[PDB]
């Protein structure tokens, strides 16, 4: 069995290996990369996502989200308070302001310590989930707007044609902006490219141990757990590495820098934070190996998780028993 300790693997494809996206994912899995839940891919030196980032300031963040925390430093939830629209240039200036800018620090580890000590005492503003792409149309390799669609994969594997579309999303971050512990919708893969700016630190639980993290979360968030049998689908709960170590939960950590891709694998729980002003692009995708995970994915039916149009068909075809209850949650 490859990668039996479930370590995060880092890959350096050549320009020739970067041509065929599906084939490279399957290669990484042949080496055990999925066992970690997360892998890093450093593009060949010849590759670029676009020519420059000099002309992005007029992108609109229609609904910036202020991430307000409650709890204790290592165990907290966050809610998202909607703020007035602002452009990317306005948001960058805000991120760089004395109130929001990254503090002086020695290295990534010192910054990680400061994040976990102090996060809860501040409310950073995140431009998340903005439909669009920063890949140049002429970039043919690993262009997250040109991937094979999940609807086409389901049709190729299972024969059933379904409605829905699959497009990428932009994230504009600042110091302390936070992504809560989650797996993807329908336990899909994700791919995330950090286009510019400061790093993103990730934490991940191996898929084979995801139920250990769920059982800890039910203990640490007991009201939320009574409200919903899949409350981590709400994407609001944070648990620190120190607390994970105290409770014996297997995990790994890694820092992504600008110009690097991260892939999350089916049922790989992940969480993390941004070091400073940055912009990332991400999308979900599927492979043949996903289908079995999609069929077994938990679902939120309490009303909180509310998701895209395209998840309807996935539930309807892969989980027909759950469909009626899940759809009530959506309505
Ligand atoms: O970058 C972020 O805020 C969150 N991204 C992801 O959870 C991802 O790419 O799967
Ligand atoms: Mg612009
Ligand atoms: Ni994710
Ligand atoms: Zn729920």
Care to describe what's here?
By secondary structure, this protein is an alpha+beta fold. The chain has a single domain, classed as Cupin (Jelly Rolls, Sandwich). The protein is built from 10 helices and 16 strands. The strands form 3 sheets. It has a 10-stranded mixed beta sheet with strand order 1-2-14-10-16-8-7-4-5-12. A 4-stranded antiparallel beta sheet has the order 9-15-11-13, covered by helices on one side. Helix 9 runs antiparallel to helix 10. The protein is globular. Magnesium ion binds next to loops.
What is the structure about, briefly put?
The chain is α+β, with helices and mostly antiparallel strands and 331 residues long. Helix content is 26%, strand content 26%.
Which small compounds were modeled alongside the protein? N-oxalylglycine, magnesium ion, nickel (II) ion, zinc ion
CATH architecture: Sandwich
CATH topology: Jelly Rolls
Roughly how many Å is the radius of gyration?
19 Å
- Helix share, percent: 25-40%
CATH class identity: Mainly Beta
Strand order of the largest sheet: 1-2-14-10-16-8-7-4-5-12
Coarse morphology: globular
Give the domain tally. 1
Strand content: 25-35%
DSSP strand tally: 16
Report the end-to-end length measured between terminal Cα atoms: 44 Å
**SS-based class:** alpha+beta
The number of helices is 10
What order do the helices and strands follow? Answer: EHEEEEEHHEHEEEEHHEHEEEEHHH
How many strands, what sense, and barrel or not for the largest sheet? Answer: 10 strands, mixed
Q: CATH superfamily name? A: Cupin
Subcellular location: Nucleus
GO molecular function: chromatin DNA binding; damaged DNA binding; histone demethylase activity; histone H3K9 demethylase activity; histone H3K9me2/H3K9me3 demethylase activity; metal ion binding
Catalytic activity: N(6),N(6),N(6)-trimethyl-L-lysyl(9)-[histone H3] + 2 2-oxoglutarate + 2 O2 = N(6)-methyl-L-lysyl(9)-[histone H3] + 2 formaldehyde + 2 succinate + 2 CO2
Main location: nucleus
């Amino acid at each position: 069995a490859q990668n039996p300790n479930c370590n995060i693997m880092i890959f350096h494809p050549t320009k020739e290996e970067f041509n065929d996206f599906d084939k490279y994912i399957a290669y990484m899995e042949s080496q055990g990369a999925h066992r970690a839940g997360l892998a890093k891919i450093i593009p060949p030196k010849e590759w670029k996502a676009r020519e420059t980032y000099d002309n992005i300031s007029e992108i609109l963040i229609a609904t910036p989200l202020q991430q307000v925390a409650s709890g204790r430093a290592g165990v907290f939830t966050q809610y998202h308070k909607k703020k007035k629209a602002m452009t990317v240039g306005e948001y960058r200036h805000l991120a760089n302001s004395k109130k929001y800018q990254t503090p002086p620090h020695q290295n990534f580890e010192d910054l990680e310590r400061k994040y976990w000590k102090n996060r809860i005492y501040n409310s950073p503003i995140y431009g998340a989930d903005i439909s669009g792409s920063l890949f140049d149309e002429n970039t043919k390799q690993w262009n997250l707007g040109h991937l094979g669609t999940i609807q086409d994969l389901l049709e190729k594997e299972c024969g059933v044609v379904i409605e829905g579309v699959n497009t990428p999303y932009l994230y504009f971050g600042m110091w302390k902006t936070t992504f809560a512990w989650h797996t993807e919708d329908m336990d899909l893969y994700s791919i995330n490219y950090l286009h510019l700016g400061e790093p993103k630190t990730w934490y991940v639980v191996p898929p084979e141990h995801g139920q250990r993290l769920e059982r800890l979360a039910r203990e640490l968030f007991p009201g939320s757990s009574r409200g919903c049998g899949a409350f981590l689908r709400h994407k609001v709960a944070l648990i620190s590495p120190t607390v994970l170590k105290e409770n014996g939960i297997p995990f790994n950590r890694i820092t992504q820098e600008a110009g690097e891709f991260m892939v999350t694998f089916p049922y790989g729980y992940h969480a993390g934070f941004n070091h400073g002003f940055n912009c990332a692009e991400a999308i979900n995708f599927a492979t043949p190996r996903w289908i079995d995970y999609g069929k077994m994915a938990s679902q939120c039916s309490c009303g909180e998780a509310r998701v895209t149009f395209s998840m309807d068909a996935f539930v309807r075809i892969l989980q027909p028993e759950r469909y009626d209850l899940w759809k009530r949650g959506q309505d």
